[PDB]
Design a binder for these strands. Structure first.
Length: 89
DNA sequence: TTTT
């Protein structure tokens, strides 16, 4: 019934490195409110909603769930706008 | 699997 640290956010891919299997999202809104200061959120390839090889393209818009982690923040599931598949490279 |  509860998972209180899990929040919803939106933004765009800051960078993504397919050799390393991760990148960052620049989060520009959370919990339905735009942010005065964008926040980087780590994104691992395993979290990307899409078929085939998983990546994010620099600048593509994303919606996601995330949670604070030991090293920063962590994306938990990442989609395009409206829950459609991410585009990637 | 935490910086670009």
């Amino acid at each position: 019934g509860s998972d209180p640290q899990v929040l919803r956010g939106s933004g765009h891919c800051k960078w993504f490195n397919v050799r390393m299997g991760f990148g960052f999202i620049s989060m520009t809104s959370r919990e339905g409110s735009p942010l005065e200061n964008p926040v980087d959120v780590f994104v691992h390839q395993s979290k990307l909603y899409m078929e085939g090889f998983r990546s994010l393209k620099e600048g593509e818009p994303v919606e996601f769930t995330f949670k604070k982690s030991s090293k920063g923040f962590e994306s938990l599931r990442v989609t395009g706008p409206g829950g459609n598949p991410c585009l990637g490279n």
